[PDB]
């Protein structure tokens, strides 16, 4: 009742867009990743740190 | 109908054997994708699959 009349009208002009559908825009995906983890790590400085 | 019917014999063996003619594809060959979609996969902009439509593919 609104989105539906969207859906049902549907023409020939919107083949393009939906006919033949390659992908489900709905569906997440994401790719499972490999381990890892962070540290911030202090390095120090080889000589005076002045001006 | 003695004549049709040694006929028929000799239709229904040679239809019974005959069948090995027409198949669906018979050998299954497994190559890895071309760099192009296999780089696109495995970054971000990879949208679900769908079973069909034919993907597009570089060369």
Known sequence: P???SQLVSYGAQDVYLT???QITFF?????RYTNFAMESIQQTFDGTTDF | TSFVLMLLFTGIILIATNELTYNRPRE???RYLPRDLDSF???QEMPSAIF???WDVDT
């Not at chain 1, 569906?27 to 790719?31: D, F, I, L």
């Open chain 2, 28 to 30: 299954i060959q497994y």
């Open chain 1, 27 to 31: 569906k997440a995906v994401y790719r």
């Open chain 1, 2 to 4: 609104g989105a539906i």
């Open chain 2, 41 to 43: 996969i495995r970054t």
């Open chain 2, 52 to 54: 069909s439509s034919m």
């Open chain 1, 19 to 21: 006919g033949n559908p």
